[PDB]
Symmetry: T
């Protein structure tokens, strides 16, 4: 494997998780009314998950010999996903579409890393697989709320418990 | 009391609880959308309760000298209640009607056992009373969601905790 | 059974528990001095018990098709027991007599309900029996402090834990 | 400060909390249907909070030299807020308006006490501030459910935990 | 009911539990070898249960107006069951027969009390029923170890937890 | 990968776990006597494990676009393993052989799924690996009890804790 | 050391603890009134301690090659202390004197065993010392309640916790 | 504010708490007899509170640039309150008067500090307010035991838990 | 008070806490060697504290009628403190100076808010005071590590527990 | 005492515990079949105990001025007990004899140390006594499984809890 | 033994522990800088230990018939050890020497008491031995920090847990 | 795969972990002084980890049909890594170099096993990966203490918790 190529893929993924933590705070506060009361807890659970993903990725970057960029504005411009802006018409349906779009991009990011490290870098592969578990969970959540397709999941116990990536956390 | 007559009433009740555990799994996964998100947790709580009822009934059957049928298909054909099939038009209202119908049949089953053992079999009477407590709870839940009649109950703390039958469980 | 007659008996019992919670607060604060320090903890335990009894009775009233009165003053006038007023001479002996009188009336109230529902309404009978357990406990407490007759009970661990009615509480 | 004037302000506030505990029980049981299932847990959380506020106010009244009125009907007539009666047309919107009206009156009551004791009675000021924290929370809850204005709060963990007034509770 | 007749039945039952606690200590220590290692834990569980039964019966005797005999030797001579002496040939089979004989006598004792108090003394009936639950458990344990008849029970979690009589214990 | 082919392999595996839960209940109750007391706890641990495996498989089936069959009898006929019937001569040796045969079939089922999804479906591969961990454990348990070959395992702490599949459970 | 002489000293001590458990139950129930409410908790703590002492002594007797007597009446006649009978005039002062007399005899019993085994039997010496710790505690409790001599101890946290002999208990 | 003047007020307060911890140990051990058994637990609770107050004050003194005196005898001579000596006639009434006198002096000390720092030193004001909460509690305790004036407080759960100053403790 | 002026002061403070969370991650990873091992835990504790401060400020901004800026880069440019860049010569002394400079700016920010809201906005004042408690703690930590001036504090128990602002957190 | 002579006795004892940890692992894995299932848990408990004994002895050796040998093979040759090899015919009886022989040698080792340090080295004597408690326990376990002599002990709660030496462990 | 001579030895030891608690507070706050950060936690652990030793000694003094001196200044002048003053040049090396000197004096004090009570006063001997365990621990800590001699101990879990004297504490 | 070749690779790895547990005990006790106090806790954490690795490897060896060597000296001679002897000049730098050398050899051992079993033995591959996670952690710890290269890790919570291999432990 090319370590430099792998390092630039991991830093871009970490930037996406960091900005997602900020934008999901705005989306949660605008899901108001009787209909929005249901989805407030689901958004909160997803937002705390992505903060934990940022925590897990940083130590692996430094083990491989990389470093974070000096200035925070340069870090935000390196995100592999588009910003989840608040829609111009902030209705429940338009908020749900923005969340679904962000989740499908995250699934593609971590699928690409697994293909690159399969059978070559055992520790990096295992960490990417653990995060991919929780991203697929979030994608099924929102597609069931927007369309009618069954997903097989219901409410968690406590937001941000992250059962797949806990062994990587301090 | 006729022990043979009492034994056949208890085995039929145990079959109904066992099949209810399977059918409620299908019903939970099809309660989708924004409206269905509310009732997913209530269905899950009821499904875990009926699994515990099956656990409590089996030891009493063997104390009285009975046994379960050899083949599982013969056991399913002995259920005292009709199968809770998924409706042809799976809307929220049609799912709620199926759940309400199943609950009212369960209340009748355990009311009949209490009349049979009143003042004659103290241990069998106490177990039937404990299960009847939780069945009346579930019936009031669904009738309040379907009609507008007040019931007096709200969300539990943890699904399947079964506060009335715990002393019978291991 | 006559459901209307049973409903009016349960609403009157709930009113007695609600007013008892208010009056026992006054009685506790006036048991002063070295002698009163002993009985302060016993009064506190009894007061928290009766609050739990009010919590358990309300859901059963709504299951049977009843409702609470609109105005709170009309609810207070329906109590099946006399008000436990602070005596004109507030000594330790006179406070103890008021407490004993209130407890014996509560025992009579729940004994009457059990006779009415014996072998006819299994769920209502079980709830009335659970509360009657704790009322008999309180009656023995005060009669031993006032007279010299042994009772067989000593200090609880934590006030208001209510070991007989917990399975009815949320 | 005039102690007599301060005492009459605290007793009136305690009466409002005591009657609010009764009336919110009726309002919770009438929030039925699919829409009402969402708001049942919020009403329950608010009702348990106001019971704790009554518990905290009573000891301070006796420290300052006051006492509760002898008869419970006279206590109910001293409440500083109007009774939260069940509306004639009990729909979800009409129930929400009654709850919002009660909360705004409570905020005004405790704001007035803080102005009176600022820099003169440190212990009374601190207790009034703690209750005012939770009243402002409840007001933002209901105004977001009725209108569309964002509030910044979502579901609590356990009803009645009261994180601001716990240090005053036993 | 005749209170004097009921009191003498309860005192005799309490004597049997007290002596059973002593004799089961001897039986446990003589179940040696590879075969006896299995049954040591079952005997220990039963011995701790009967100590709890003695604890529960004493307060009810004093509530009804009775008292324990002055001298401990007179108390031991009032037991309603025969002494569980260590057999002359202390083999595993002979120890098991002694245990089975003691359990069947206990079941008969508490069945008789329930018939006497059915529908007349609600509190005494409930306590007798709770102990009868655990005695029937112990009887099924030993008959399955001696004969081959299935019983439906296996190892408990912690000896002496007594899940049916806990609400009567301090 | 062919999603339709993968879906039919997962549904057949889920049917085997569901029927295993029923048949192991019969086998546990017939392991009587002094010799059978040892193996009762091991059978109980295995039975609770397979119930958890059914819980983990169902959500993944719905994520991939599958569904459970409508009728429960059709579900039972799809099991990938033969029914673990009670032997005609129910001795300890014959019960042990039936258990060993069922375990070796389960190991083959999940080994086949891992080969199919290796390096192509990361989430499905990880779930199949987790269940395969516990199946290999159970196989070593029974082969050591039947033959004399050492296995390296001894008693668990609490039955059904399932340390390998917990992160997939709710 | 003479093992036979040591064995007869340990069996007599175990008999005293066993009978003390019975007699203290009677003494606790007769400490009535306002004055007796204080000492009820102290008697309860001492009674549970002596039950634990009986539990600790029995295993050591069997290690040294002794056994308990066959019949329970012969065991009671071997106690090294006189029976703590209820006084003819059961006042608080007369009950306190009986308790003090029993405690001073227990201190003498275990002091004698320590002198016999000092520097010869390390395990027997350590067990006798542990029990002597708690007996000296109880003696100081009662002498301070009867006379005015300060003792240095106040209320325990939970009765029967036995902090000195716990490491000998199961 | 004058920092030097504020520093000398805080050091004198810390000396009073340190000496109070020593003198209350003597007072607790001399509250003997049946009457003194009640007040032993209250004195113990107050003594542990004042030890915590000393712990909280020391870090703030060093933040502001002060230091403790070199020799411990000079520290004891700086206390702002008089020593709580054991009275010449150590009866329960005379001990209670000494405790009441010490508490009223402590209330005056911390009231003076709050007036000095109001609106000028936010952190010092908050710490002084927290300690003043618990001193007012202790004053009401003793005045109710000595006179008959109601106070509104009863027994704590665990001595020295200090619910108002915990956030300042390590 | 001017609500618009207060809102712009709170948003700027929230931006400083958000960027501090990013920059302290870089500073912690560069405190290497034997000397840096000591200060790694202190930096980690401070970094988790400032994340909690961001969590507490956001709900109050929305209660007052404000909102966060749309784009994350605009939010970062509004911080009231300068960026804590990694020094060009990353030695232990130069890292310590950067940390000390950031802490003194935070103390000034929250002191200014308290002066603005004193006696006018009770809820905003209390929240600002709670954060100011922990900022003064951090300032004393670093000044003692850089200079020799005593501070009065030592190691916490668990990083990020935040004992002063917990009641504001979910 | 001769410190050099005491040091060589403690190092030899530590070597025996270290090698016992290795050899008991082999013995546990070869106790197969239905008979061996009983004794697997007892061997596991003893093996974890001896690991804790090695942990406790090492700090005391360094306090007295000793050190461990440089090479691990020289350490193994200093053991005061013979190696517990797997018998040539590995049956249950032959394994039990090897375990019994090892335990009796350990009892002799620690009895010798206590005689040497009695009344001269209080800290070394106390540590040797604590380990001797658990060795006598293990000796009674195996002699009861091999012969029929009663021992007075049954199954522990959790292996390796070591209730006598815990205060010496970290 | 001479009780008067033993009493004066115990009172002098209690005075040393009480003054040590004050002086160690000053020493902890002056161990500043990067080097002092390591030893702050060790000093804190030792200071909390000596407070517990004072708690354990006081009850034994009153059991033997002694009392504390009336005035606190007379108590401080009776200490058996010299005051641990802050050195004129407060460097890390000079602080360490003061701590080491205080610890060696404490070891001598409790060694002397054990020689006096060996085989004559079992309860006093056991308490002196327990404290001597922890004093020897502290002595080894400081001698390893000052010189290079290995000690065998490392960081505790929680300061002031005192594992050897806990059974003497309330 | 060749099972014989795989078995000899696993036995050699288990020998290295067993000897590492002994040698790290010597290294920890010689890291003295002010500088060594920092690294004592890190060495302790690593030593407890390697003991857990030995526990996990032994059961897998017996599942595959292998066994441990008869004599412990032959087991020690099979280690795949060189002995970590104490250096002739035991300074902090020389101890750190020995630890770093041992860790890099362990990383190579488990990397080799993963390459051998990739896609052929799923259970053996997963266990080797779990241990490789923790070995890479330890390698980064020591290289950051010796050189200045950042690693990204700081202090654990409790030594020997082993978050990656726990699911393999009992
Ligand atoms: Zn993410
Ligand atoms: Zn059911
Ligand atoms: Zn309120
Ligand atoms: Zn019994
Ligand atoms: Zn104070
Ligand atoms: Zn050992
Ligand atoms: Zn000390
Ligand atoms: Zn390792």
């Amino acid at each position: 494997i090319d370590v430099e190529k792998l390092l630039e893929l991991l830093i871009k993924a970490a930037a996406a998780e960091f900005t997602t933590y900020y934008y999901y705070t705005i989306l949660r506060n605008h899901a108001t009314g009787l209909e929005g009361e249901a989805i407030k807890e689901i958004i909160e659970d997803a937002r705390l998950e992505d903060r934990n993903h940022f925590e897990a990725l940083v130590p692996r970057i430094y083990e491989l010999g990389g470093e974070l960029p000096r200035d925070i504005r340069e870090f935000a411009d390196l995100a592999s996903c588009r910003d989840a802006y608040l829609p111009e018409e902030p209705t429940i349906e338009n908020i749900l579409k923005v969340l679904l779009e962000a989740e499908r991009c995250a699934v593609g990011v971590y699928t690409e890393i697994c293909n690159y490290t399969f059978g070559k870098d055992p520790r990096t592969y295992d960490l990417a697989l653990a995060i991919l578990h929780e991203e697929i969970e979030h994608e099924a959540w929102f597609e069931e709320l927007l369309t009618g397709k069954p997903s097989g999941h219901f409410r968690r116990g406590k937001p941000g418990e992250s059962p797949y990536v806990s062994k990587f956390l301090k």
